[PDB]
Write a protein that binds this ligand. Sequence first.
Ligand SMILES: CCCCCCCC/C=C\CCCCCCCC(=O)OC[C@H](O)CO
Ligand SMILES: CCCCCCCC/C=C\CCCCCCCC(=O)OC[C@H](O)CO
Ligand SMILES: CCCCCCCC/C=C\CCCCCCCC(=O)OC[C@H](O)CO
Ligand SMILES: CCCCCCCC/C=C\CCCCCCCC(=O)OC[C@H](O)CO
Length: 318
Amino acid sequence: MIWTGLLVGFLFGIVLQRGRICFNSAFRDVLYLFKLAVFTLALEMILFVLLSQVGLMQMNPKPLNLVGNIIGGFVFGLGMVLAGGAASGVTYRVGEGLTTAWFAALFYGLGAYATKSGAFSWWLSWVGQFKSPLSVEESAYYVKGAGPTISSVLGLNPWIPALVIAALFILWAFGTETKFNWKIASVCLALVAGLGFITSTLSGRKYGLGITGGWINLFQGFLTNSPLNWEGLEIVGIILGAGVAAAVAGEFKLRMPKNPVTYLQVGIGGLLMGIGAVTAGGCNIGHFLTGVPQLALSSWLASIFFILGNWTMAWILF
Ligand SMILES: CCCCCCCC/C=C\CCCCCCCC(=O)OC[C@H](O)CO
Ligand SMILES: CCCCCCCC/C=C\CCCCCCCC(=O)OC[C@H](O)CO
Ligand SMILES: CCCCCCCC/C=C\CCCCCCCC(=O)OC[C@H](O)CO
Ligand SMILES: CCCCCCCC/C=C\CCCCCCCC(=O)OC[C@H](O)CO
């Protein structure tokens, strides 16, 4: 059943490559992607509580760690701008044929590994002491010991804030040239997110779409001989689906940057991202795309600082 990760990641890479969902150029606002993000977030907000109510799922919000979330998200934004894309853009653009993406994803994997259990694990160990003891109790909506949410703190059934924020986000989007329209893209992305949440919970990992854990699992399987899980097969599926969707659309091509220093630029970027995500407890997918619709406070804070670090590094380079 861990091989359902391959299929979920295949569909994920297809929708990512076709919709061109770049998170690094989404956190930089248009002087399409913003509305795509808000609509996907609202649809996931409704769908997660729906699937948890019908017993197909349980939301598992990530724990709160102010130092962790804040600083890791800032560094993750820095690295995402230095790498020319966050953890999703990089990973799926590997399959499009961009060698820059190859470094970026590879140094991202190495840095995440080193931060979790390697030369940078002292920093993660020091950060872990600021973990918030706040946790929710087991419910039809939440897994026992999960992080605090907007609904849990307000003492409300998750349906209430889910529906209110989601309806406000739909008003949001609909109130203000590709034929893969942003609404159908959001619908397909939310459906893929729900499918991933379900199949991953049945796989043993009670969570939705992620990136960091998949790369860590792949590197661990290659260098440790450990068995791969749902997330590593999901990463391989992301790459495979992005590649297939780019080749069918005639968009696949092995490419190089204009100047070789970009290779040095992205290689550092990914590294920062690897240190960022693991410190922040999540990437642009694990926190923003997956944890925000669960109304996780840690995910919202981590996304805030994703965008802040993005802005800082964007001014530094530009
Ligand atoms: C410093 C960050 C470098 C990032 C490079 C990414 C690519 C990884 C490949 C080789 C790195 C080898 C260097 C590993 C540095 C830590 C090794 C270590 O444990 O250092 C102990 C110390 O030197 C007393 O024994
Ligand atoms: C140039 C940069 C210099 C450094 C500035 C970086 C900006 C972030 C700093 C602090 C945020 C976190 C503040 C720490 C708050 C207290 C520790 C904590 O989070 O504790 C929570 C837990 O419930 C009980 O420990
Ligand atoms: C209407 C749309 C939603 C609006 C609402 C957005 C919800 C807040 C989001 C992110 C902040 C999350 C962190 C908030 C700061 C927590 C700091 C704190 O007090 O933590 C203490 C300690 O860690 C434990 O007791
Ligand atoms: C180049 C321009 C750079 C401009 C500056 C970059 C952005 C700095 C903004 C915010 C830093 C963090 C402040 C956020 C508040 C942290 C304090 C906090 O969360 O405290 C919790 C408390 O400890 C619970 O017990």
